[model samples]
Target: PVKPNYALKFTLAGHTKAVSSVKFSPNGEWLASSSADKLIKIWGAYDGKFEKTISGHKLGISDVAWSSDSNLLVSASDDKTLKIWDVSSGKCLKTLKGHSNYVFCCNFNPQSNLIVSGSFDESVRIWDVKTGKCLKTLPAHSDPVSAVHFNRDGSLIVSSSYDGLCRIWDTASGQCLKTLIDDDNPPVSFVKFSPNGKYILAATLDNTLKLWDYSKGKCLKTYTGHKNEKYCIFANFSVTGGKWIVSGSEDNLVYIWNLQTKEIVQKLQGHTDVVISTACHPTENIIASAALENDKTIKLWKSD
Candidate 1:
C-alpha cells in the first residue's frame, strides 16, 4: 500500500483558477507554474514563497518549459501563440505566432537552438529558437498535436497527438523517423524519450502504457493496470539510463514499473481524484503529480 498520510506542505493559493502545469528548474532552485487564471507564477521551491507573477496571455496558459540554460521560460496558451520570457526579468523576449489554434505544448532542444511546438491546430512545428522563425511545419496528424519533446542528445523528437499515434522525427533532417499508431485506440495525451534516448514511452487513452524501442521501431512493453487511462507517464532514469517508469492516471494511482523485470514495482495511491499530470526531478527520486477538475492539489512523492 502507498502512503496516504503524506502531509501537504505547500499550498500555493494565489491562482484564481485551476493550475495546469508546474515544473522545477534544471538546478532545482525555482518552481514555475501556470494556471487557468491566465497567470504564470514563479516560486522558491524550498520555502514555498512566491517570487513573481507573469500576466500577459489573453487566455489561460497550458504548458511551460525552461530553456536549455534555464534562464528563459517558454509558455503556450489558448491564445494560439508561443511566448518566451526572461525568467528573472519577466520580460517578453520573443513571440512565435503561427499556430492557428490553441498551442498545447512547446519544448526546447537542450543541446541546440531549435524548438518544437504542438498545437490544437493539428500541426507540429519546428522553429529556430534564436530568430523565432518557423523552420518546418509537420502536418500529418489527423488530430491535434497534444505533446512534444526531444531526446536527451537532441537527435530525435517524439510527439503524441489526438490521432492516437506517437511519431518520432529525426531532428537533423526534419523527417519523421517512425510513427506508431493504433486504429482502435483513442488519442495519446503524452509521450517522452527515455532518459537514455533509446526508448520512447507513451500514455494513451486506451488505458494502457507503452514502451517502444527507437532503433527497430517496435513495441517492447505494454503495461495495463489502471482502471482508467493514464494522462501522463514520466520515465525517471538514473545516471546510467537504467530508470523505472512512473505514471499518473485517471484512476488516481501512480504505478512504478521496472523495465527489466517487466513488472509493477509499486502502486502509489493517495490522490482521491484523477491524476492529470506528473513530473520527476531530473536527478532526484522525488515525483510530483497534480489532479484535474475539482481536486486542485499538487502532491509530491519520494521513493523509499
Candidate 2:
C-alpha cells in the first residue's frame, strides 16, 4: 500500500533556544512543544495556530508528556524537577522533585495515576502524582537515561540510556525484566512500546533504530539511513498508521520508513540543524518535528 503524502505545513518560530521535544495531546486537540529556553507552547493541532505559552521552569526543558485525558502536561527540566501543569489555565499544579540531576525524559501511564521519568542521575523513578511522592527508583543504567516510556497496560516500562542498553522493568516491582543489546552496542537514545505493546522500538546512537521482540529478547528489524551520533534523537511508530516509522535525524530531515518493508519511503527536509524530536498526532496524519541549535522552530507535516 502507498503511504500518505507527508508535506511541510508550518514552521513555528516561538522558542528562542533549541527546541527539545514536541508532543501531541492524547486527546488530539492540541500540540505541546518545549525548549531549552524554558518555555512550552501550546498550539492548535488542526490549524497550526499558536494558542498559549507556558513558562515556569528555571532551566531548560528536555521533555514534555501529556496525560491520557490531555488536560495536563508534565515537563522534565534541567532544574532537577518535573512540573505538572494544567494546560487550560497554564498553571503549575505540582513540582515533583527527587532526581539529583537533570531530568531528561518523562511519560505518564495510561491511567494518568503515575509518571515515570528518566534523568542524568542514571535512574528511572516512578512518581505518585496524587501524593507528589517518589514511588520507586530503579538504578536503570550506568549512564544518563535518555528516554523512558510505559506500555499501554502500564505494567511495564522500557528505558534507554547512554550506557548502551534498553532495559525493560516491571512497573510495579521495579525489577529488571529484560535487557536489549544491539550487536554494535550503541547507546540507546530513545525507546517506545508498540501501540499494541508487544514490540519495542529502540533508537541507538549508531544512526539506526531497531525493533525488538522483548518476549524473546530478539531484534526483528533495523531501520537505518539517519545520522544520530552526538545528540539523543528520537523515533516512533506513526500513530496515524502504525505501518510507518517516523524519526528525527542529525541530517536535518524527517525519515519515514515502511514498517514491514524496512525501507525509507519518504523524507521531509527543511531544517538547517539537527532534528532531534518528532511527535506523531494521535488521530491525524500530522507529524510535529523540532530541531536543535540553529533551527529552533517547530515544523508541522501533514498527509491527507
Candidate with top lDDT is 2
lDDT by residue for model 1 (117-146), tens: 999888988888789888898884888887
What would the per-residue lDDT of candidate 2 be over residues 1-304, giving only the tens digit for each residue?
A: 4776888899888899999999999988899999999999999888889999999999999999999999989999999999999999999999999999999999999999999999999999999988878999999999999999999899999999989999999999999999887666788889999999999998887788889999899889999988888888878798575489999998999999999899998899899999999989988889999999898999999887
lDDT assessment of candidate 2: 0.92
lDDT measured at residue 221 in model 2 versus the true structure, 0 to 100: 92
**What do the candidate models score in CA lDDT, each in turn?**
0.74, 0.92
RMSD of each: 3.1, 1.1
TM-score of each: 0.88, 0.98
Model 1 residue runs over 4 Å out of place are 1-11, 183-185, 227-242, 269-272
lDDT of 1 at 145: 85
